[PDB]
Write a protein that binds this ligand. Sequence first.
Ligand code: AMP
Length: 433
Amino acid sequence: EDDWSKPLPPSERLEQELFSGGIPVEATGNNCPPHIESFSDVEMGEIIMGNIELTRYTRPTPVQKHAIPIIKEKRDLMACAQTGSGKTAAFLLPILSQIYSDGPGEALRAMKKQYPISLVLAPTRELAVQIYEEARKFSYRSRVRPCVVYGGADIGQQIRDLERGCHLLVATPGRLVDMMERGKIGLDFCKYLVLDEADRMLDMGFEPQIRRIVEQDTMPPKGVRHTMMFSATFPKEIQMLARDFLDEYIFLAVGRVGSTSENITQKVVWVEESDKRSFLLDLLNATGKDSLTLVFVETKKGADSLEDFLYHEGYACTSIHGDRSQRDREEALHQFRSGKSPILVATAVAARGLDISNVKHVINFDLPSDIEEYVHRIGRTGRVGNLGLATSFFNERNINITKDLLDLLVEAKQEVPSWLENMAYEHHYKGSS
Ligand SMILES: Nc1ncnc2c1ncn2[C@@H]1O[C@H](COP(=O)(O)O)[C@@H](O)[C@H]1O
């Protein structure tokens, strides 16, 4: 049989291809394996150590010091770390290491529809490619062929890439489901599940697809598969997702766990329904050359009406809602992402699963009845380096979220309209006399 631990012949055109480019730590859980200080503190194999040297990694990052020995000891992981912490290599290195050591497993040898040994789920195309490229570096001179798929691109070329073999699959949840329904991917032998930037995936409304992939198909249950979740923040829906997806897991926090709606400037203004169009025009006239603007409306009839208004007023824009054919919605998303139509009108429901690459300005033309939905919507702007802007139109129709919105603005240390805190005021708490 095949030896998956002993490296394949090199290829320096491929080497130049791959490798010629540019404080507190909390760990809680039961029987947590001790952290490492060097990559050699645990045995990650011949192939991994060789590829580590090609990538010129000299010392493990904080998150790698703790996560790598955890994953290698086959323990589930909930990790709160931010971008630039080296979390990609933190799960790729021990996973690939174990695959080299263990091999494909008797199933894939008795067969040799693609069956990934490892699956990494990402919110966006950009992050998906980042993970994919790192995987190529560490799968070099091995028999693990990494593949990446994502929406907004030709599925035909992605299917072709898949059929050349994939043992590690990086995917956005929507395109993976599409591959599964088309019968191109099976999860029967997926032993390594990774959710990278899980919080943003839920922001973009990927949770149903994720739970369909993990819980409703053929993927091994927890305790059999090894599952790792990485998230910058730790809101309640992530905690619930962690409890459901993880078994006997270690909680790792590198730095302070990020706040909800961080890196976002939020403005709330009072606008009557009749004035929302004109008010929007003033907001659009304070827009840069092409900074992408995402406008949320409640209904599809409202979306069409708004776009019709914007078109007549001379604005380059497009729309995405349910009453559109799929050919129109895919082209609309293409024209938004390319800046040809820098203004996207969309209902929240239609925006779900779409790779809208965090715009510079989110405008809540209509506010939701739900503050958790508000958090998901404004999450469509703001990163780490780029401060995002979220402007919301508020009137009597939104009175039910007055207090939650106020509380959120205060927690995020944002500006509060004096009329908003006035409307939220409760005389019960003043006291007698
Ligand atoms: N051990 C390491 N030494 C040096 N750079 C690293 C290490 N691990 C990851 N990186 C870099 O950190 C970035 C990855 O950030 P992240 O988004 O946390 O995966 C990439 O630029 C990597 O090259």
